[PDB]
Amino acid sequence: GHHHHHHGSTTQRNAQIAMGRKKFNMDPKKGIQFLIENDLLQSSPEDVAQFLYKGEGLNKTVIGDYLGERDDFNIKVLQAFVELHEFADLNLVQALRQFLWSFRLPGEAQKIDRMMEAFASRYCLCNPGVFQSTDTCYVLSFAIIMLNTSLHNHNVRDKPTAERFITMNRGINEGGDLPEELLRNLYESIKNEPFKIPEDDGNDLTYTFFNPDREGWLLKLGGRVKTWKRRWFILTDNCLYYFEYTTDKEPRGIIPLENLSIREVEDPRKPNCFELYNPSHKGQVIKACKTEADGRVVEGNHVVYRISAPSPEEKEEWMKSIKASISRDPFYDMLATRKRRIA
């Protein structure tokens, strides 16, 4: 007696949906074009952003690849993508948890930078007055990511305390300090729960963001006067600093590593030696500054800096660290630059 509906066949539409997804996961530009041509997606940056944000059956690494691109359209998609995230009334860790669920960070430094700039800008708009600049937010985001790696990756031996995390971030708020309890809250959140990463392979940027800076006591040979001195070395931002005491703010000397190279060397008396030298200008004095006993700062007089380590293992470690510093890392450098514009 009762009438019944006419139900339409859904075979072809579901097939197109599935086809579009399959295509996207192999090539995001081509999948998006297929869906648009098949009237399953609208062509605006906002519409593409909603599609990626929902991400139904979409590979999150592929989403990140597409959003990071320099194309005018992709830049617009990215901004609309970040706008679909609500960061209001969330702290920076909580906002990062949310954002990092939606895609997987690409490998290329310029792509990461575009995405994290877009995130930081959005966070600051959602939470005005928390950070004095977008730069502050961006840098702290990477401090949080590095903390996640330090705490949760077993390859990092020395786990930072809350107090280390707080002091590491001194000056980040455009020259001033962020609230102690805010930094503590961020630290505690990460300590309690690592970033949960979708489709995690165990090699995500958030788990492998290591700190390459180093410190330690070594014995160094003098310039004009050939005496060996025990000095506290710090390697950071492609420069080798050395100090009389670990507690000094004023270094005994500063050796920019730009244009230098390092080689293992035999010494008649000291074991485990290496040398900094300028490979392009043989015999040339290395640009450096140091302090004299009278308190003057003067140019260094070294053609080479010969340095003795207490073990072959430590020599190897320092050489590796110094070589890595010289070859540089584009993203480390980009962070360095933002930190300089903060200060």
Ligand SMILES: O=P(O)(O)O[C@H]1[C@H](O)[C@@H](OP(=O)(O)O)[C@H](OP(=O)(O)O)[C@@H](OP(=O)(O)O)[C@H]1O
């Ligand atoms: O301490 P004495 O025996 O007087 O000898 C000093 C030290 O070796 C200095 O090392 P440090 O600065 O670590 O104390 C060195 O400066 P460098 O740091 O430039 O190697 C001086 O080189 P010259 O200034 O080039 O002579 C050298 O005269």
